[PDB]
């Protein structure tokens, strides 16, 4: 009643309404980044592979300079990195 109006009013959405009265669907993308690892990234841009040439490779998070060659190292089906007793990056599984 008076001073007791129902809080919600309905939208009158008729096809003959002017554009300012027509139902527009709105999606708001709210982007949140914080200490938690960034999990939703844009489609990752991967370049081509070239062997036997000193390049600045960026296999996933790992970056570095060097020439990369096909190898016989039998990685386990889950391993990505390669390393040695010197704790330096020796080999890498091609991500794609």
């Amino acid at each position, epitope marked *: 009643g008076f001073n007791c109006y*129902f809080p919600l009013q309905s939208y009158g959405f008729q096809p003959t309404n002017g554009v300012g009265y027509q139902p527009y669907r709105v999606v708001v993308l709210s982007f949140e980044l914080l200490h938690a690892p960034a999990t939703v990234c844009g489609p990752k841009k991967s370049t081509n592979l070239v062997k036997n040439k000193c390049v600045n490779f960026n296999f996933n998070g790992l970056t570095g300079t060097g020439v990369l060659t096909e190898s016989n190292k039998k990685f386990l089906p889950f391993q990505q990195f390669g390393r040695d007793i010197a704790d330096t990056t020796d080999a890498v599984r091609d991500p794609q």
Partner: antibody
Framework: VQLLESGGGLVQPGGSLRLSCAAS????????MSWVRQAPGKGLEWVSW????????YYADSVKGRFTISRDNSKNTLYLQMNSLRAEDTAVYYC????????????????????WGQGTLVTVSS | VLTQPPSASGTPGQRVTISCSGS????????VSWYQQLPGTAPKLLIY???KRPSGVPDRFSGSKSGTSASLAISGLRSEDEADYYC???????????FGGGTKLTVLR
């Protein structure tokens, strides 16, 4: 913003007719509507008030029962059926927009009869 | 009922106080409004709150509701200021937007 009334004319005593108030220039569903009576050369006599059809309709003490107000938000119209009309009701009827929804910064005739139509004239006489 | 003077008046340039009074249900607990009906024309709301004034109205049309008495102060009267000034307020008890009697303001020429 404009409210145009139609249906004012000759009425036999005890007759029945329908004032139609076409409201344009504002979102009709958001503002309450009202009818206000003005006898020729006399003061404003409030007729009735409505906000929602399913809600409570308010009527003057002298018109309770013989008047019926209604809305049509699809047509943006306010309708007033007056039946069993009595002699003192010969007057001019104004269709007035009664804002009941005030927003934060927009300060607008909240609870004031904001905009009044041109008003029609009803003669209850044989 | 908003008991209002039947006909107030004043000379041009004066400040006329149109003071109407109803009850606690009429005006004490509800927002009063002041309308200016020129002869032959629909009324124009000059005051919508107890004090506030809508845009498009000269700043001289002041309003002030003290307790149960609402005062419409018109300062600097002119040939356009002569009209019927009604005060209207919603009734919490009777459930009706009761108007005032209607003050007939005229300028002292």
């Amino acid at each position: 913003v404009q409210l145009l009334e139609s249906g004012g004319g000759l009425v036999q005593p005890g007759g029945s007719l329908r004032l139609s108030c076409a409201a344009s220039g504002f979102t009709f569903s958001d503002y309450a509507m009202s009818w206000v009576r003005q006898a020729p050369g006399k003061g404003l006599e409030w007729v009735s008030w409505i906000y929602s059809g399913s809600g409570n309709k308010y009527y003057a003490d002298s018109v309770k029962g013989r008047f019926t107000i209604s809305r049509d938000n699809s047509k943006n119209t306010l309708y007033l059926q007056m039946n069993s009309l009595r002699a003192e009701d010969t007057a001019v009827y104004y269709c007035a927009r009664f804002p009941i929804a005030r927003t934060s910064n927009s300060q607008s005739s909240y609870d004031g009869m904001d905009v009044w139509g041109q008003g029609t004239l009803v003669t209850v006489s044989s | 009922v908003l008991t209002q003077p039947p006909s107030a008046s004043g000379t041009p340039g004066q400040r006329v106080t149109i003071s109407c009074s109803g009850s606690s249900s009429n005006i004490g607990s509800n927002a009063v409004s002041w309308y200016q009906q020129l002869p032959g024309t629909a009324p124009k709301l000059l005051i919508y709150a107890d004090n506030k004034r809508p845009s498009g109205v000269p700043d001289r049309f002041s309003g002030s509701k003290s307790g149960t008495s609402a005062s419409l102060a018109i300062s600097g009267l002119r040939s356009e200021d002569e009209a019927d000034y009604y005060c209207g307020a919603w009734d919490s008890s009777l459930n009706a937007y009761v108007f005032g009697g209607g003050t007939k303001l005229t300028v002292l020429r």
